[PDB]
Amino acid sequence: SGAMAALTAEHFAALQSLLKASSKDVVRQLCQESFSSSALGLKKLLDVTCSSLSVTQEEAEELLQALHRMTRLVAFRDLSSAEAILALFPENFHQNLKNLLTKIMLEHVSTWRTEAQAN
């Protein structure tokens, strides 16, 4: 329990793998797929994640778990301002990656919150 209370050190470490992405669009799509997927269904995204980011299977799994948690937390708590989302992050997390993730959360939170709160 408390899954929605915080992202863990392992989550934040895993999200840093997104700096290997070849474009911002890859990050966007990984956020959307990780949200829509159940945690137990994230294994279905491993091959495309490994192949797109050139990461290990373990890096991909940890990343996908982190994105799944972050996007669900944003939806569950209705974190719908940059202020609210920025509050999740450590000071020692890459600033422009954080800003990108915040941007992407804001692009989807209204739809995500509706989808999640319906279920």
Numbering used by the authors: -3 to 115
Pull verbatim passages from the article behind this deposition.
The COMMD (Copper Metabolism Murr1 (Mouse U2af1-rs1 region 1) Domain) proteins are highly conserved in metazoans and unicellular protozoa. There are ten family members that play key roles in intracellular trafficking and in the regulation of transcription. A hallmark of the COMMD family members is a highly conserved C-terminal sequence of ~70–80 amino acids called the COMM domain, which has no known structure. The N-terminal domain of these proteins, which we refer to as the HN (helical N-terminal) domain, is more variable in sequence across the ten proteins, and is proposed to ascribe unique functions to the different family members.
We next determined the structure of the Commd9 N-terminal domain by X-ray crystallography to a resolution of 1.55 Å using multi-wavelength anomalous dispersion. Overall, the Commd9 N-terminal domain has a globular architecture and is composed of a six-helix bundle with a meander topology. We therefore refer to this domain as the HN (Helical N-terminal) domain. The overall structure of the HN domain has a similar all α-helical fold to the equivalent domain of Commd1, which was previously determined by NMR. Compared to Commd1 however, the HN domain of Commd9 has an additional α-helix at its N-terminus that packs down on top of the structure, and a large disordered loop in Commd1 is better resolved in Commd9. In Commd9 the α4 helix forms a central core element that extends the length of the HN domain. However, the topology of the five shared α-helices (α2-α6) is similar overall. Comparing the HN domains of Commd1 and Commd9 using DALI showed structural similarity (DALI Z-score >3) with an RMSD of 3.2 Å over 83 Cα atoms. The electrostatic surface of the Commd9 HN domain reveals the presence of two basic patches and a negatively charged region, but it is not clear yet what their functional significance might be. Mapping sequence conservation of the Commd9 HN domain across species shows conserved surface residues mainly in the α1 helix region.
